[PDB]
Amino acid sequence: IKQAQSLLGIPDYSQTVVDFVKMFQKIIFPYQLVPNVIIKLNLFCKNDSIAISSSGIVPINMPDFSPPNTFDYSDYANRTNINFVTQRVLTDGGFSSGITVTPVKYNYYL
Amino acid sequence: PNLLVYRQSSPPVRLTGDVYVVDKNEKVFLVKHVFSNTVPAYLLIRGDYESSSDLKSLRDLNPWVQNTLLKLLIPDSVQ
Amino acid sequence: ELINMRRYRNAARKLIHHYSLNSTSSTEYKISDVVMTMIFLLRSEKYHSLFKLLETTFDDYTCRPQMTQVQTDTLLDAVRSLLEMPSTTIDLTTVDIMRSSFARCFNSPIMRYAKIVLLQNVALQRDKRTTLEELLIERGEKIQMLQPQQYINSGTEIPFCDDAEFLNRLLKHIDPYPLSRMYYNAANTMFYTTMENYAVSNCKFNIEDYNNIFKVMENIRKHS
Amino acid sequence: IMRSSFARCFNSPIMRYAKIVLLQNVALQRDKRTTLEELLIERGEKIQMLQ
Amino acid sequence: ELINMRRYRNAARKLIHHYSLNSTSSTEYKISDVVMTMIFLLRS
Amino acid sequence: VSNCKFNIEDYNNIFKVMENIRKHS
Amino acid sequence: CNKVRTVTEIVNSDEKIQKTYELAEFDLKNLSSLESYETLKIKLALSKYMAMLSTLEMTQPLLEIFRNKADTRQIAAVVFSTLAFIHNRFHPLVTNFTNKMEFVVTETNDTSIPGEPILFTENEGVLLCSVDRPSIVKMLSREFDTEALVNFENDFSITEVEATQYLTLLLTVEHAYLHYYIFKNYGVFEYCKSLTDHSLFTNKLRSTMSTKTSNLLLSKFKFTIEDF
């Protein structure tokens, strides 16, 4: 919290922790995702939130749990695709190292 | 940190519009930028730059931007 | 199972680090180690590509094998996973050096006391051996073309930390390090880097002359 | 016989790429010979300052 | 396939004869022969 | 410890020898 | 003689002490003192270098800096600082440099001089510093052995695998500085010839008015290749 404050919060509010958390409470709902402040504020015990309508938060999860097997990752998990994209970005940027590419795998369900 | 390619300008580049300081020590600045399609966004540039007006505070952004900045700048080596 | 997978893993790790990365490690390696390593590669289906590459050189040891880009990518992935060093450059020179070393070893007879031969062998490009002056002139021509990158003109005195505590703490932290190990590592590292650059350059190195004469010159000038 | 022969063959080394041998035999080996005069002069400057 | 069983078995036999019999033939055997023999024995 | 090479058997030896020679006659 | 005999001349007597001593103990103590002093000098030099690099105000680790091909400013700064440090070591009176150095970083085999990484040149009265960053990365990333294998025969986050890299940078820049000094003290032809020999360092580098005494970070230990 102190690091976040120093980054952007100038003064020392009385309940500055509550201030941060409500300042992100204002946005929790409409964008349908956890504010990373809450995530860092917390293995497993994964937290979520709700609305009166049926929908989770972290992936926009259904009220049951993380789906077991929804769809294959053939076009992404293959080493060829990740290597091609890595080489493309490295060539475009002029880098030699320091760039990591990860397939979009944390896709529970759209 | 590598993606923030530190541009080297002599003299420092003047900028127009709102400017926000991120890492004054490391010259990380946030600048409003809008594509012709009026898709508002901010560019996290790093280098030698100066504004033509006072540099507004970081704590006056739409909290979405603030959460993005929090996830970006602060190292996450601790868990 | 009937195979000590862990021990053979360790042996293969050590031998590949010895040949490819050519790390400072330098100990006697016996036929046991190579046999264990080959068995380890054959066992792992992931490493069948490496196994086939090594096997190919048994008959002809004088060529780089022809592969495909995808094969090269998979080979790099297998080697990187084995070595568990993603933060290193192992693109192509590493593989060529490994092939050359294994070509030498497999096509070498049995010896009582080692061979101790430099890894300057089986260079690529099939180019005629070139001299230092020719290649140096040719490459300097490219170097001297254009493109500087920073113009530091006035020159500020080289900065020095004025705090003694910042120095005493560093002395305390660095003192336990044995000096001999540091010197040996640095020297071997410079040697290996020079060897690899020279081998890729496809020229004729001075085995025990250029580095040796350089050392001799330093010792003589400092002493007499 | 098979045991002994396989044994002796396995115990043999294979190959190494050489390395750098570090000796620094008998350290300095009388490279520097210092006299009492200059050493005393330098040290006497140190002690004569203060304390 | 990935293995030449015939060549590997032939090399294994030759090396075993050389060892056990102490073959008088002046034909030194490459270490690759030993590795090939070991692989052939393991597969069999 | 000073790493200098003193007079092997001159300076100390001259000290003792002068001391003893003047001790005689 | 192997041993030295001391006899006390007692006035007006016959009884004497005849004590024999060896030079071996004195030689051993001399060698121990000399080795300790040399070790202290080496560690002091390394500490100075590390402190200077720390004062450079750089956020990232050294090897990480040398891996960032995207920016060459940091690499040029580090190389310039190290060269200035070597110049200070040889000639403590003078610190800075009269001329300006243009730094160029090269990332291909064609630029790579076969063996001498830090190519030092000058054109039209201005010094030029050519660098092979890939070779530097390769040397800095060879998994330096840390196990205790003496083999002498005849708070802070600084591990051995880091001090080793700092020393390696010192050594490489040292060879570069020797070649540059040869270039400066003589003609371009001399520098070109020396590049292919390394056998002309014996000109005046010994203890002289123009070349002062120094450990040079390489006389601390004799070394050689064990080829036949």
Coordinates of N, CA, C and O in Angstrom, one line a residue, chain C residues 152-158, chain G residues 79-89 91 94-101 103 120 127 173 177 180 184:
Chain C
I152 N 31.0 11.6 -26.5 CA 31.5 12.1 -25.2 C 32.8 12.8 -25.4 O 33.8 12.2 -25.7
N153 N 32.8 14.2 -25.2 CA 33.8 15.0 -25.7 C 34.7 15.6 -24.5 O 35.9 15.4 -24.5
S154 N 34.0 16.3 -23.6 CA 34.8 17.0 -22.5 C 35.6 16.0 -21.7 O 36.8 16.2 -21.5
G155 N 34.9 15.0 -21.2 CA 35.6 14.0 -20.4 C 35.6 14.4 -18.9 O 36.2 15.4 -18.5
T156 N 34.8 13.7 -18.1 CA 34.8 13.9 -16.7 C 35.7 12.9 -16.0 O 35.8 11.7 -16.4
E157 N 36.5 13.3 -15.0 CA 37.3 12.4 -14.2 C 36.5 11.2 -13.8 O 35.3 11.3 -13.6
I158 N 37.2 10.0 -13.9 CA 36.5 8.8 -13.6 C 36.0 8.8 -12.1 O 36.8 9.1 -11.2
Chain G
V79 N 32.3 0.6 -20.6 CA 33.6 0.4 -21.3 C 34.5 1.6 -21.1 O 35.7 1.5 -20.8
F80 N 33.9 2.8 -21.2 CA 34.7 4.1 -21.1 C 35.2 4.2 -19.6 O 36.3 4.5 -19.4
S81 N 34.3 3.8 -18.7 CA 34.7 3.9 -17.3 C 35.9 3.0 -17.0 O 36.8 3.3 -16.3
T82 N 35.8 1.7 -17.5 CA 36.8 0.8 -17.2 C 38.2 1.2 -17.9 O 39.2 1.0 -17.3
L83 N 38.1 1.7 -19.1 CA 39.3 2.2 -19.7 C 39.9 3.3 -18.9 O 41.2 3.4 -18.8
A84 N 39.1 4.2 -18.5 CA 39.6 5.3 -17.6 C 40.2 4.8 -16.4 O 41.3 5.3 -15.9
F85 N 39.7 3.7 -15.8 CA 40.2 3.1 -14.6 C 41.6 2.6 -14.8 O 42.5 2.7 -14.0
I86 N 41.8 1.9 -16.0 CA 43.1 1.3 -16.3 C 44.1 2.4 -16.5 O 45.2 2.4 -16.0
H87 N 43.7 3.5 -17.2 CA 44.6 4.6 -17.4 C 45.0 5.2 -16.1 O 46.1 5.6 -15.9
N88 N 44.0 5.3 -15.1 CA 44.4 5.8 -13.8 C 45.4 4.9 -13.1 O 46.3 5.4 -12.4
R89 N 45.2 3.6 -13.3 CA 46.1 2.7 -12.6 C 47.5 2.8 -13.1 O 48.4 2.8 -12.3
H91 N 48.8 5.6 -14.7 CA 49.3 7.0 -14.5 C 48.4 7.7 -13.6 O 47.5 8.4 -14.0
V94 N 47.1 11.6 -14.0 CA 46.2 12.0 -15.0 C 45.0 11.0 -15.0 O 45.2 9.8 -14.9
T95 N 43.8 11.6 -15.0 CA 42.6 10.8 -14.9 C 41.8 10.8 -16.2 O 41.5 9.7 -16.8
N96 N 41.4 11.9 -16.7 CA 40.5 12.0 -17.9 C 41.2 11.8 -19.1 O 42.4 11.4 -19.1
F97 N 40.6 12.0 -20.3 CA 41.2 11.8 -21.6 C 41.1 13.1 -22.4 O 40.0 13.8 -22.3
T98 N 42.1 13.5 -23.1 CA 42.1 14.7 -23.9 C 41.1 14.6 -25.0 O 40.4 15.6 -25.2
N99 N 41.0 13.5 -25.7 CA 40.2 13.4 -26.9 C 38.8 12.9 -26.5 O 38.5 12.6 -25.4
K100 N 38.0 12.8 -27.6 CA 36.6 12.2 -27.4 C 36.6 10.9 -28.1 O 37.3 10.7 -29.1
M101 N 35.9 9.9 -27.5 CA 35.8 8.6 -28.0 C 34.4 8.4 -28.5 O 33.4 8.6 -27.8
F103 N 31.8 5.5 -29.6 CA 31.6 4.1 -29.2 C 30.7 3.5 -30.2 O 29.6 4.0 -30.5
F120 N 40.3 -1.4 -30.7 CA 40.5 0.0 -30.4 C 41.2 0.7 -31.6 O 42.3 0.3 -32.0
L127 N 39.6 9.0 -31.3 CA 39.6 7.6 -31.0 C 38.3 7.0 -31.2 O 37.2 7.6 -30.9
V173 N 39.5 -5.6 -20.8 CA 39.8 -4.2 -21.0 C 41.3 -4.0 -20.8 O 41.8 -3.1 -21.5
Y177 N 43.6 -2.1 -23.4 CA 44.4 -1.0 -23.1 C 45.9 -1.1 -23.4 O 46.5 -0.2 -23.8
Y180 N 46.1 -0.5 -27.0 CA 45.9 1.0 -27.3 C 47.2 1.7 -26.9 O 47.6 2.7 -27.6
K184 N 49.5 4.1 -29.2 CA 49.7 5.5 -28.9 C 51.2 5.8 -28.9 O 51.7 6.8 -29.5

